[PDB]
Amino acid sequence: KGKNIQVVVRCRPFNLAERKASAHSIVECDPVRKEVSVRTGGLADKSSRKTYTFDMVFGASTKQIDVYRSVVCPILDEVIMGYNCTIFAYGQTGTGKTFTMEGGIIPRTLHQIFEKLTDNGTEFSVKVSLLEIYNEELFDLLNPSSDVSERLQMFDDPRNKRGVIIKGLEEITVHNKDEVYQILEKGAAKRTTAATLMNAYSSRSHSVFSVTIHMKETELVKIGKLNLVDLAGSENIGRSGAVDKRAREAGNINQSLLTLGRVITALVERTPHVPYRESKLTRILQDSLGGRTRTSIIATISPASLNLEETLSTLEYAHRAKNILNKPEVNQKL
């Protein structure tokens, strides 16, 4: 059941780096269409095109706020219902993982969350967490109080097999927006991963930011949870010419991105075994995968012809995401 997992594609305005690249926008975004078309060339020159039709499609032009509004606001209501929701950002840094996170998205969100809840008037508490997944290890950003790595182990809580429990991380509740920001600023610093040669900044680690909201009204008690996941991406080591350690780390993740290719081919498969446990990320994710959790994916792509692989890889993943059946259920609790 659940609504199908929602997938939107965003094509970045040609990155300045792209411009230095003199990358050319093969990519065409027809937002009316919600079509995105890529000059593959096929074998042929990229007269040849590959065209996809998307749940939502944003050209470079698409303004950030708009995106959010269209994607976040509906999620926020689900959180207030008790939904568990997750939004994952994929694709190129140029495409604006960084463009998206630098600005909101996060700072904007906590303000709105309190505003909607308090207008709701529900008695509520808000707790946040921020961790980074680096080389298959967990590190607490959110609480500098907590360690650089939050004490991280995960077990099954029997209620949901997919449902898991991450012992030791603490979200600290604050009724006010303000307290959250103070954490927010703190968290960010911890969050930051390694910069890259190619990009000023890169996400070495996948970042998972989670906001849990406890709501009580006269008595019905609901709990809403939102996970904002920012992909960590690798570049070809060979291209990078990065130090071996750097290459290695990139390779690990990159390889992991194949393993993420693989599990998602399984979800499409509806194959008996879904390799959630092969990554900490997909295990944590695990209950969300077409799961009860209401999930949305924002795939960012570069018009640049230069990176064939990422364009092709984002196109394959968009197909593979739809296939898995997302059963968001409002996790409304009384």
Binding site: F155, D156, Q255, L258, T259, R262, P272, H273, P275, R277, E278
Partner: protein, 429 residues
């Protein structure tokens, strides 16, 4: 170079690893002085890389002595070629696991670090890079498991770069001395499996049965079987280290073996596989080795080869083979069973020929593949553990061990998840 540290631990491995190292040393043919008795340069260099040269050109074996109890090492040292190892090289905790995976695990570790660090430092210094490390112990028995659990994580942890294979005897599903005994193993192994890139295990029972049956001896001797096992290992080391007309690097083979790295481990196979009388009396024809390998009997572990599926099978021939022989062997495999061959990838098997035929028989081969049945069987054992869990015997001791129940549950759980895949292996051809 690229020496690998050899580890013997667990009492089993206290024998077994020791046997392996010693036999390998025998393979060295280096005199007990540690100088190289063997005329052969080729062996000498390869061994020599393996064994740091003491003055007097002694060969310093790459091994650590771990004692369940200190006597065990003593027996080892009192055992032959004590001299070759410098006593400095090894140290062992007196305590040992105590045949408790957890209990040993917790207790051992403190000792473990001290011992490991010194040796590891030396070893790290010793070669520019080690291919990896080999562990010998019995998981099924409490210490192999207990030590292994603690050791493996850190040891692996130290170099993610290094690729390590572990050896442990798996408890015979047929019988256990105690129910608890495999219990210690199970947690260890379960934790171990993810931890260690490669595990090589043979069920004790099958090995004993096969060894015994083949032997037609009253029983297989522990040592002898260990010797057999060590022999199995030795060929791999020898062949790879040694030049070969076709030699495959460990990396390529290893990566190759798993269709992708996800597949955690493959189960060992030995060739030639023959009965004691049969093999000893009989000489292998070129096809001969393959056939033995092919049959169920070949697998050290007991499995029905149909029941199992082979992700891949690899054999290392030792010595030269005729190309035609290459053809014949390869051809047979595909022909023999569709399912046996992996449908997906042709040329499932890859073989390398050792440049030099092994000491003794000219041709040697190894078996690679997994036994579906065997893995499944093992999981069943965990189920037995589960049943035991209903008993909830020795929960307290476990408590003393300090391991949580959840680890137990999960340990089974992960295994359960994996095991189904195991069947899947068979399901796929």
């Amino acid at each position: 170079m690229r020496e690998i540290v050899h580890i013997q631990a667990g009492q089993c491995g206290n024998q077994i690893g020791a046997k392996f190292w010693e036999v390998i040393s025998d393979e060295h043919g280096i005199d007990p002085t540690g100088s190289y008795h063997g005329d052969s340069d080729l062996q000498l260099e390869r061994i020599n890389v393996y064994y740091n040269e003491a003055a007097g050109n002694k060969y310093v074996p790459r091994a650590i002595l771990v004692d369940l109890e200190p006597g065990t090492m003593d027996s080892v040292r009192s055992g032959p070629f004590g001299q070759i190892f410098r006593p400095d090289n090894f140290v062992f905790g007196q305590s040992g696991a105590g045949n408790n995976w957890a209990k040993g695990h917790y207790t051992e570790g403190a000792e473990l670090v001290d011992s490991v660090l010194d040796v590891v430092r030396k070893e790290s210094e010793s070669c520019d890079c080690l291919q990896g490390f080999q562990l010998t112990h019995s998981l099924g028995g409490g210490t192999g498991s207990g030590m292994g659990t603690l050791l493996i994580s850190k040891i692996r942890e130290e170099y993610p770069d290094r690729i390590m294979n572990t050896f442990s005897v798996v408890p015979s599903p047929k019988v256990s001395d105690t129910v608890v005994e495999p219990y210690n193993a199970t947690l260890s192994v379960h934790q171990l499996v993810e931890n260690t890139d490669e595990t090589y295990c043979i069920d004790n029972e099958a090995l004993y049965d096969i060894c015994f049956r083949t032997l037609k001896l009253t029983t297989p001797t522990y040592g002898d079987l260990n010797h057999l096992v060590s022999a199995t290992m030795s060929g791999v080391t020898t062949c790879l280290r040694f030049p070969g007309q076709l030699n495959a690097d460990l990396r390529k083979l290893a990566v190759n073996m798993v269709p992708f790295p996800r597949l955690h481990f493959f189960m060992p196979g030995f060739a030639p596989l023959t009965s004691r009388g049969s093999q000893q009396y009989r000489a292998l024809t070129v096809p001969e080795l393959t056939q033995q390998m092919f049959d169920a009997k070949n697998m050290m572990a007991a499995c029905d080869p149909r029941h199992g599926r082979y992700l891949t099978v690899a054999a290392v021939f030792r010595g030269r083979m005729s190309m035609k022989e290459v053809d014949e062997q390869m051809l047979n495999v595909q022909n023999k069973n569709s399912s046996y061959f992996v449908e997906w990838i042709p040329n499932n098997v890859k073989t390398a020929v050792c440049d030099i035929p092994p000491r003794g028989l000219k041709m040697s081969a190894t078996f690679i593949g997994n036994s579906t049945a065997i893995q499944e069987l093992f999981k069943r054992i965990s189920e037995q553990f589960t049943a035991m869990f209903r008993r909830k015997a020795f929960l307290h001791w476990y408590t003393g061990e300090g391991m949580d129940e959840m680890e137990f549950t999960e340990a089974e759980s992960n295994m359960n998840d994996l095991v189904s895949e195991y069947q899947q292996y068979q399901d796929a051809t």
